[PDB]
Design an enzyme around this catalytic site. Structure first.
Site, PDB file in Angstrom:
ATOM      1  N   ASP A  35       0.810  -1.185   0.084  1.00  0.00           N
ATOM      2  CA  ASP A  35      -0.037   0.240   0.208  1.00  0.00           C
ATOM      3  C   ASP A  35       0.954   1.212  -0.021  1.00  0.00           C
ATOM      4  O   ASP A  35       1.436   1.717   1.061  1.00  0.00           O
ATOM      5  CB  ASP A  35      -0.830  -0.061   1.287  1.00  0.00           C
ATOM      6  CG  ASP A  35      -1.694   1.182   1.239  1.00  0.00           C
ATOM      7  OD1 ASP A  35      -2.018   2.019   0.216  1.00  0.00           O
ATOM      8  OD2 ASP A  35      -2.486   1.401   2.324  1.00  0.00           O
ATOM      9  N   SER A 199      -0.726  15.491 -12.013  1.00  0.00           N
ATOM     10  CA  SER A 199      -0.874  15.104 -13.423  1.00  0.00           C
ATOM     11  C   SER A 199      -1.058  16.308 -14.475  1.00  0.00           C
ATOM     12  O   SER A 199      -1.562  17.459 -13.733  1.00  0.00           O
ATOM     13  CB  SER A 199      -2.090  14.245 -13.573  1.00  0.00           C
ATOM     14  OG  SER A 199      -2.484  13.984 -14.796  1.00  0.00           O
TER      15      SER A 199
END
Ligand SMILES: OCc1cnc(N2CCOCC2)s1
Length: 330
Positions: A35, A199
């Site tokens: 994770d 992004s």
């Protein structure tokens, strides 16, 4: 040193991925959920409340000659999905894909929430976010990667998750045969303890690319892609019959639909998520309503590039003094 381990989807939907981890001496192999959105290595154990164990493999520290109680240390974690666990702490030897760390903090669960009990395939979590998020008290502990880093050939790990197939976690090296083209690297902020990046935009299907900054985290422990309600509405507007149900928990679509791809930007590069990766199947057995793999982050507080996005790429987690992320197509 290096490590290379295979990671395998837990079910036919790729809801999560499990990776075998050798703990203790002799080894006890547990299948952990790696994770990158958390920083605790915790396991089902011989100390876990018996009614809360249902088919998981347990760590028994009393059977490990290298286990040592970390005196006074406790841990307690709550995850973004509302699940939680807590317990005490041992140090022991932990190996992943042939890479061995001695003195790793292994957080033994005394209590786990129902969603963990109900998933017999996941024996615990291995956190790969920054150690500043580790919950051990009163002495915070280091992640497996932080402990291994100085010994690694290069201070990196990579995630290569499969679509409906196994993939690979590598430690200490970048497998140049595992991706196509080049790797595009992008800046990381560690201010929240996550692999947080920006992004450069998105496209829906064959549509034009929209240049827009989208801050979010690269999180292997989250199944879906969670993005701004504007971005998410633009994607579901291209699927006939799509609706958002407060009652189901987000966007759903008719199972007869063909889904468009979704592209996200990494610098000037582009990662394409095929439409099939966005199908999470019927909401309940036999239903013709299917659950979408791209969902709004509006109620989270952060955008999350979870497995739906990451499994479309070869992803480099570069833990150099100034961390960066790399993405390549594959
Ligand atoms: O090639 C790196 C490896 C992957 N798995 C390995 N092993 C080591 C022996 O105990 C089982 C796991 S070595």
């Amino acid at each position: 040193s290096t490590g290379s381990a295979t990671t395998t989807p837990i079910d036919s939907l790729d809801d999560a991925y499990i990776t075998p981890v050798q703990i203790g001496t002799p080894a006890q192999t547990l299948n952990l959920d790696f994770d990158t959105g958390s920083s605790d290595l915790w396991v089902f154990s011989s100390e876990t409340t018996a009614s809360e164990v249902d088919g998981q493999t347990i760590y028994t520290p009393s059977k490990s000659t290298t286990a040592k109680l970390l005196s006074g240390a406790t841990w307690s974690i709550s995850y973004g999905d509302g699940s939680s666990s807590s317990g005490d702490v041992y140090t022991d030897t932990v190996s992943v894909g042939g890479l061995t760390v001695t003195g790793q903090a292994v957080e033994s669960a005394k209590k786990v929430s129902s969603s963990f009990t109900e998933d017999s395939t996941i024996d615990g979590l291995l956190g790969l976010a920054f150690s500043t998020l580790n919950t051990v008290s009163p002495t915070q502990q280091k992640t497996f990667f932080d402990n291994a880093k100085a010994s690694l050939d290069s201070p990196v790990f990579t995630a290569d998750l499969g679509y409906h197939a196994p993939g690979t976690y590598n430690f200490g090296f970048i497998d140049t045969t595992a991706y196509t083209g080049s790797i595009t690297y992008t800046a990381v902020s560690t201010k929240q303890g996550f692999w947080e990046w920006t992004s450069t935009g998105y496209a829906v299907g064959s549509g034009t690319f929209k240049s827009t900054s989208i801050d979010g985290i690269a999180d292997t422990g989250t199944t879906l892609l969670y993005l701004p309600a504007t971005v998410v509405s633009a994607y579901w507007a291209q699927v006939s019959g799509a609706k958002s149900s407060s009652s189901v928990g987000g966007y759903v679509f008719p199972c007869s639909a063909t889904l468009p791809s979704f592209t996200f930007g990494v610098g000037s590069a582009r990662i394409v998520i095929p439409g099939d990766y966005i199908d999470f199947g019927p909401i309940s057995t036999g239903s013709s309503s299917c659950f979408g793999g791209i969902q709004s982050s509006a109620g989270i507080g952060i955008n999350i590039f979870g497995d739906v996005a990451l499994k479309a790429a070869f992803v480099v987690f570069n833990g150099a003094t100034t961390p960066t992320l790399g993405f390549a197509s594959k």
